[PDB]
């Protein structure tokens, strides 16, 4: 069983569909993506709309999001939840509580890390009264609020976030739904960055992935090159190696065709492909496109490619890239788990189990570079850290037989960790 | 006729009722009001709930506001509305299209400046189609965005500012309503300030003041003193200063009784003498209280005292400073204009008109503590600047007869900007 979904943007007012929520058109959006052979959404409520003062949340708010979710299990979609937005396509929305004349750190000050506890709990109790509501995770890529290049940086050390993750995580748990928490890229690819490859691969209930081909694998590598569409494959590859468990799941939480570096009529390849070379990791539990309705063209400030990331276009109308992510579903929802790999890239790790160079493992760095150049070569190449590589009887548990080091290693030539040139 | 009336907080949710109001607790609010005597209320929306997008209008926001204008209206109460919140009792509601990765300055930008004028347009017409809207201000104290102590300024000249309120205040004009915008008291007494006191006494349709003892007044002249009471007339006359038109009209939009520097049992007296101060100036067309219900104790991160400034209590119930205000409304609401008056202390003034020292027209600074002598001594001052005291003309024509100049300036010894000494 493999899981295919989309990020649900309402198709008439996007997110800010949560200032008034037009029902009958939420209940409709959420009927087409069912009929594309669908089986969950991931659905975004407003942080500042849910709790507009630190003491004080918004209950009709919550009853709102109660309903998006009771709407799709009624068209038979599986719902999960992210609380913390925060950051959207680009867009903070912050509490202003946390800003200018309050201005506080959201990971580190006790007292708001006590008001999202309770604001998550708040979420999760009156989610659970929904059969369809099935995992909640923290925020989407809350991580981008936490270091440079944010212009409002709230910083904090590895062992601060920690400390945040466990304070979060256990408020989010309960029969039925998984805990969860997302991040941007950085994680893999930015040294001294605090959100790190071994707490997305241990903390939570799977190991959560955005996988983005404009931070410089598309045009580093080539839009319609081999590495690019072998880029979501990498980064599931890439993101389970930091986990002491070998089998942990691994969501691909977010896909999409970006056409500020593919161009139009390519996407629906370039689905095809990403989705087909992904789901050749068995540790896969599901692909979640990004996203299901374009952005409606009367919204201005998006980078201009967002408008057209739906499967859906403004009309409501299926895309051909649409009918492709539906084929995929159609194909691969019962197919069996790849098979194991046996060839494997070794990276060298702190005694925590973090990659001592993060630097390398970005697009165009070395480790990224040796990852394609076997990809490319026919070879299946998994990926594991210095301390599996170590240990005989690990290696021979995983069926791991021939191992390449990065022996001359070197930073990424290609990334870059912002969505649009204009930040 | 002298207008009495309140800065409308709700009793129930304070303005995140917007988020969720409780429509009838909303009508028992403004019912209290109207019997209280009030003839007019002051309500608030909030920015980012109106313009989430800074293409996009969310229009049941929008309605939401004409629906309380109206209800305020069915107790025969006015309405004056302000835009741009923006800041409201130290928390800034900043829309995301001007934050973070998008942070603007909504001064300068064309694309803001657009925007802003696209909300005022609609506000104003659709606010129109009921009698008992009858004023728009452009936003709550404006200014405190524009300069330091602003923790992220979006900073401007006093030529820009010029510019900006030229941009917007014909958008909000129009048959049966005012146009007004508002400013916090550094408009007087900060120098190089980009809002001026010039800006402040021509542009809109009255002289908009916000009057609060604890910017210094009470703390270095006395909570109880003759000074103290009579601050708000010093405000009043000051800034009707410097206008062109002697005659025009002095709104007095907010006065409240901060229990940081007022004793509790004290603050139904200095409202009292308060009131009864200001109307010693001709110009005063109303007196509009702050506010109109207590700030709910549930929600958090407020200055303690202001919890404690409505004229009711949480419960609904009138307190004692309530009770007074509405007396000084049968009072006064009919009384004869204050009689003129022939002593003036002179300011110092550049070409266009504004003061060549601010700080010197602060609590404790030189301009402020000779007026005060003077009206402690019963000498009834007003105010001038340079200008008109060099022009035998124009001091006939006010029938001005003696003249009192700062012979040694100095800067305010009282003077704080903030509320609370946390910001
Ligand atoms: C300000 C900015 O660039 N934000 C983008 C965000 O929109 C996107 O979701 C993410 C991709 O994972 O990359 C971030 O850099
Ligand atoms: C940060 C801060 O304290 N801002 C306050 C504001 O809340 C208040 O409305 C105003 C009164 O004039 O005084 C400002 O200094």
Redesign the interface.
Known sequence: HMKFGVNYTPSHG?F?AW??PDWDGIDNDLKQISELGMDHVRIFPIW??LQ?????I????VADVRRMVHIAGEHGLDAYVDVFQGHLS?????P??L?????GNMFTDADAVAAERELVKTMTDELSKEPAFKGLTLGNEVNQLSDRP???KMSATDRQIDAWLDALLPTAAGEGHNALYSVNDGTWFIDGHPFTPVQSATKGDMTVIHSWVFNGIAQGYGATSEECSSYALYLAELAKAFGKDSERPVWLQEVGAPENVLETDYTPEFCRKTVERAMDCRNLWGVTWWCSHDV?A????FPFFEHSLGLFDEQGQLKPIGRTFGELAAQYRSALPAQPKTVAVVIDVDEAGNPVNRSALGPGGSVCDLWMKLQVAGQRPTIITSQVAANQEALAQRGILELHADEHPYAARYYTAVSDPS?
């Open positions: 996007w800010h200032l008034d500042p709309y507009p003062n630190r003491t004080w918004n209950k009709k708010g680009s867009f903070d929305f912050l202003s509580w800003v200018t004349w309050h201005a944010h212009p409002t409606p009367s919204m201005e400030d930040f």
